[PDB]
Amino acid sequence: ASEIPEKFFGKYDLDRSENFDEFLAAKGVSWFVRQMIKLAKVSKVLAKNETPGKYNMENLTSKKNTLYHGWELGKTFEAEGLDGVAHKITFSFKDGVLSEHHIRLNDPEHSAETYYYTIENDQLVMKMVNNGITCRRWFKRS
């Protein structure tokens, strides 16, 4: 079997959101940019890596795909961006919640982002908390 339950795996398409505009506004995002972000379509993929014990997560949009591959639960890893800047990313699973923790090393700890994924009514639910704002986005299975 697998540590992450079988129901988590698959491709999911963004369906709806709650409190997301308010989540972006508390981040300093302007109304014009909030309008384009809320319109963007995104799909998420969770899959098992070719080697046992590792998993892949993918973010799909019309022009930019991001793919985190070969990661293990609890094991922090590092990835470097285009300009060289580095991020530490950690995936963790406990009590039906997959957590995705990002942090920018160059930036202070204020870049502490955490995404919480649950399977609810056969949909992928993503919870984000930041600046005291909680928002949820629902992704329907493909």
Added chain:
Amino acid sequence: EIPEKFFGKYDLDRSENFDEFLAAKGVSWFVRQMIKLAKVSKVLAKNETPGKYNMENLTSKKNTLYHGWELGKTFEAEGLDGVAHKITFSFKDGVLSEHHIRLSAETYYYTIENDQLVMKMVNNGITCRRWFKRSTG
């Protein structure tokens, strides 16, 4: 419009002035040591639709793919966090320019020199260059 020699996969080989470049961006000494240690690969490819292109950045556990873009046409990219990325690709005089804007101007200049991919960056007054050798196999 992008010449044929630009396409392929390249592995990071060496850099010049990359330390002071990061130091001018505020990166700490300890973080700077592991950044230069990181292996990085880049892929430049034609899209299945002619007139469009793909570019990929490959690291140990994270790959980023910009796909289906056109020269001179700005596009918007949206990440989980929600930091809009205004990325533009242009070509002229043998130089491929990648312009990024967070809605933080960053411009990457790519050339093919001695059959290697060469990336130039200019930020905070420091010019840095990185060489990528064509992937063998």
